[PDB]
């Protein structure tokens, strides 16, 4: 049932199987499925995740209506995701007015004013990065980036959100970095989510969160009385609740961990397989920060090829892959009727690799984003941070944390591929925008 | 979990058991449970139907805020009720804007103008009533009212809603009158409703509704081309859908059946155990309609003791027992904070029998509603039809259908109790406002 939806509206798509929908077509991954569907069906198409209708839209005018214009009136939420337990109050999982209050109350945390105050702290573990790096460099052994970056990425979270100062790679024992068949059974059995929920099963392991919950309550009452995300949520509390504040901490911790380290690894793959771009970036760094001067807030925004390199990697590897909004009312946007209940989905990975909006889309060409060519880029085809009132609230912090890392790591080292390095990088066919094989590179000391 | 709700708000109530809530206290019925809770806990209290918090309110100012004032903004819907299938679109089960459109689109059906046109049709089966009655009267055998009334009640539905003219008691074969452990398992297992729904299990037997669905589609396309509820929904179709129209037919059919016949039986019990009121009512009928004149629209509204007798029966037996609204937002009405999610419930049966607002509440005293005493009655303690934008949409049709019946049946007969008649009437301890033993009376010919 409901599988006749798109056949009634005149919207093309793959014919679904009973019960399953189209999820069998996920056998080559989310990204390859969207890329094929765009080629064969066109500007708009639909499919089913179980009994769930999802409408893919690629018209950049209609993407602005969803993500920006009618965000507050029709497209406010993302598709339901459970069982979640007390993480119902996480800002990325909240809906409607509860999100709006959390967005409003958590928004002042990522201002450039606050973000500028994070600069010295993020600059402390950029020095612990180089140090550990040189050590491994001397060992002349190939290096796994996702580890050395993940450790750096956790080092910057603990500090930025709780003031917990750990050298997580050399201090593995302290594991703030505690951090498939299941969810597909959940899409075909959405009727079973209330089964788990009333049993306190949660997609987030209850031992991690119970550790953070009592950890946060220890930091709340230690700093009361005695520059981090917690201080900013502690001074905010309509105001913040105590368990609510525990739920935002977990979102921030992950976001600053996986997203930062995963993107920083993609970047250094591209820089290692395109040495000209690495030398050009290193030339720019030493023209802005000579004598290996330490990056400051104003110097990092001053570096343009750093932004082009960052932006272009995000084009080839937008770690979100898709953006989604639920349609909560009957609506007709840009000449198309969308019924209440449909998940409107923007295929970000596919749009970033569309030969209509990009020349040689499979190529790492940072000049795409040069100041003479960025005016050509449509802001609704290239959405690595989403858009509209529900975009990535940590976009400014993420772009600054990575660039602060890149400047310090490339002021001291240069990265060359290894024989066991995977060229070309084949993406993991699974549900995360990750490499099939972890990224390994040679590292030498300038 | 959630069972600490009313203990956190300072609201009294019975202590719930795990999983079950207070439903074990339903062992003497909905009505006796509310009456006890009002006596022991006061003006406001709370309990749990499973994990569902329900807040009972008896303050008539606060009842106006829920049923009338903040109906459109906070208290628009009744508590979820499933599995229902395609009856999701029934006007009594719809929610928010979908109800508002159906209420607006079905409202012109019950105007006094249309209701006045129903008078001759309802007057045809009032004559089939007397006839069948005299027959049984001659047999000098005690009479079961719920049968002879239910047959009359079905006769008036088929006619009023489809033009199907049947003597349902003498024509049992044609069964438009096709019409517990389950629902209590559903309140403790609300997580299982999606299990049944995705299996097309429906609390309404799928054979009845599939018979009406194709029956309605036969009448729709027979009268297109060729004074009933269907003609009025056929001319209305934002406009009505075809399956939607099938769902409203089923609500109307039942409402006009059970409610009309069940109340008409309670009335004739009271008139038989209070012969003075019966003679006084019969005296009034013959002063307005002499020579057994046929009731017309203007003569029935002209009869006041008929309204007092009708109203008073509804006080002693309000067939709805409770009114309910879901609280869809945090709110503070009349100095009390009600959180999003709580079912606000008005205990109608209990309020009708409160010794604060009624003298000798256990007594059938129609003078309660005499023109000199009705100004004393608070319209929010006495709510046999609810109140506010979501009251009974068929109140006018129901009050006219019964009174049209009463005038014709008492112009020709008088009713006396039998030895097997239950005095006093003990109400069914189950979940419906019905007698424990069906009502039987002697019937003699004037
Ligand atoms: C390379 C790094 C990152 C990328 C590419 C990225 C991308 C995204 C995207 C595409 C969205 C959805 C936007 C939409 O639906 O329109 C999102 C949401 C979000 N991001 Fe990020 N993100 C990154 C890092 C971070 C960081 C460091 C934080 C730190 C707090 C963060 C916090 C969030 C939150 C809380 C949301 C949900 C906000 C809401 O729904 O209101 N992200 N991100
Ligand atoms: C003695 C006869 C009747 C009584 C005492 C009665 C009582 C009630 C009550 C108390 C409600 C709920 C009001 C509220 O929640 O505020 C209701 C709703 C309703 N009644 Fe009746 N009723 C009767 C007969 C009828 C008849 C003949 C119809 C014919 C169509 C009908 C149609 C409805 C409908 C459709 C609703 C739901 C309306 C909505 O929620 O918008 N009822 N009734
Ligand atoms: C933003 C993003 C990820 C696109 C998102 O909105 N995703 C939705 C919401 S859920 C997810 C829960 C969560 C929170 C914290 C830690 C772990 C998990 C969440 O809140 N992310 C935001 C916080 C961190 C962040 C990440 C990226 C950018 N910015 C910030 C749905 C989703 C995600 C994955 C699968 C899925 C994955 C694999 C296999 C099958 C299904 C299925 C559904
Ligand atoms: C108005 C009323 C009844 C108070 C109502 O709103 N009830 C709700 C909604 S459901 C019910 C479905 C329905 C529709 C048509 C035919 C059958 C059933 C419905 O729509 N009624 C309105 C139409 C007819 C009508 C009746 C009375 C007055 N006016 C009109 C919830 C409800 C009812 C009974 C039990 C319950 C009962 C027994 C045991 C356990 C639980 C549990 C929950």
Swiss-Prot record, chains A, B:
- Quick one: effect of changing residue 29 to D? In allele CYP3A4*7
Q: Describe its PTM? A: Polyubiquitinated in the presence of AMFR and UBE2G1 and also STUB1/CHIP and UBE2D1 (in vitro).
Tissues with expression: Expressed in prostate and liver. According to some authors, it is not expressed in brain. According to others, weak levels of expression are measured in some brain locations. Also expressed in epithelium of the small intestine and large intestine, bile duct, nasal mucosa, kidney, adrenal cortex, epithelium of the gastric mucosa with intestinal metaplasia, gallbladder, intercalated ducts of the pancreas, chief cells of the parathyroid and the corpus luteum of the ovary (at protein level).
**Gene3D superfamilies assigned to the protein according to its UniProt record, in alphabetical order:** Cytochrome P450
Q: In which pathway does it act?
A: Steroid hormone biosynthesis; Cofactor metabolism; retinol metabolism; Steroid metabolism; cholesterol metabolism; Lipid metabolism; fatty acid metabolism
Provide the effect of residue 143 to I: In allele CYP3A4*9
Question: What are the alphabetically sorted keywords of the record?
Answer: Disease variant, Endoplasmic reticulum, Fatty acid metabolism, Heme, Iron, Lipid biosynthesis, Lipid metabolism, Membrane, Metal-binding, Microsome, Monooxygenase, Oxidoreductase, Steroid biosynthesis, Steroid metabolism, Sterol metabolism, Transmembrane, Transmembrane helix, Ubl conjugation
Q: Which cysteines are joined by disulfide bonds?
A: none
What does the UniProt entry say about where the protein is found?
A: Endoplasmic reticulum membrane; Microsome membrane
GO biological-process terms attached to the record: aflatoxin metabolic process; alkaloid catabolic process; androgen metabolic process; cholesterol metabolic process; estrogen metabolic process; lipid hydroxylation; lipid metabolic process; long-chain fatty acid biosynthetic process
- Entry binding sites for heme: 392
| E.C. designation(s) | 1.14.14.1, 1.14.14.56, 1.14.14.73, 1.14.14.55
Carries keyword Transmembrane?
yes
Cofactor(s) needed, names only, are: heme
Quickly give the catalysed reaction: an organic molecule + reduced [NADPH--hemoprotein reductase] + O2 = an alcohol + oxidized [NADPH--hemoprotein reductase] + H2O + H(+); 17beta-estradiol + reduced [NADPH--hemoprotein reductase] + O2 = 2-hydroxy-17beta-estradiol + oxidized [NADPH--hemoprotein reductase] + H2O + H(+); 17beta-estradiol + reduced [NADPH--hemoprotein reductase] + O2 = 4-hydroxy-17beta-estradiol + oxidized [NADPH--hemoprotein reductase] + H2O + H(+); 17beta-estradiol + reduced [NADPH--hemoprotein reductase] + O2 = 16alpha,17beta-estriol + oxidized [NADPH--hemoprotein reductase] + H2O + H(+)
What's known about how it's activated or inhibited?
Activated by cytochrome b5.
The protein's GO terms of the molecular function aspect are: 1,8-cineole 2-exo-monooxygenase activity; 1-alpha,25-dihydroxyvitamin D3 23-hydroxylase activity; anandamide 11,12 epoxidase activity; anandamide 14,15 epoxidase activity; anandamide 8,9 epoxidase activity; caffeine oxidase activity; enzyme binding; estrogen 16-alpha-hydroxylase activity
Q: What is the effect of changing residue 185 to P?
A: In allele CYP3A4*2; exhibits a lower intrinsic clearance toward nifedipine
Question: What happens on changing residue 91 to V?
Answer: In allele CYP3A4*4; significant decrease in catalytic efficiency
Q: Kindly identify the disorder that the protein's record connects it with.
A: Vitamin D-dependent rickets 3: An autosomal dominant disorder of vitamin D metabolism resulting in early-onset rickets, reduced serum levels of the vitamin D metabolites 25-hydroxyvitamin D and 1,25-dihydroxyvitamin D, and deficient responsiveness to parent and activated forms of vitamin D.
Q: How does it assemble?
A: Interacts with PGRMC1; the interaction requires PGRMC1 homodimerization.
- Additional remark text: Chimeric transcripts, characterized by CYP3A43 exon 1 joined at canonical splice sites to distinct sets of CYP3A4 exons, have been detected. All are possibly produced by trans-splicing. The chimeric transcripts exist in 3 different combinations: CYP3A43 exon 1 joined in frame to CYP3A4 exons 2-13, CYP3A43 exon 1 joined in frame to CYP3A4 exons 4-13 and CYP3A43 exon 1 joined in frame to CYP3A4 exon 7-13. The longest chimeric isoform (CYP3A43 exon 1 joined to CYP3A4 exons 2-13) exhibits 6-beta-hydroxylase activity, while a shorter isoform (CYP3A43 exon 1 joined to CYP3A4 exons 4-13) does not.
The name this protein carries in UniProt is Cytochrome P450 3A4
What organism does the record attribute this protein to? Answer: Homo sapiens
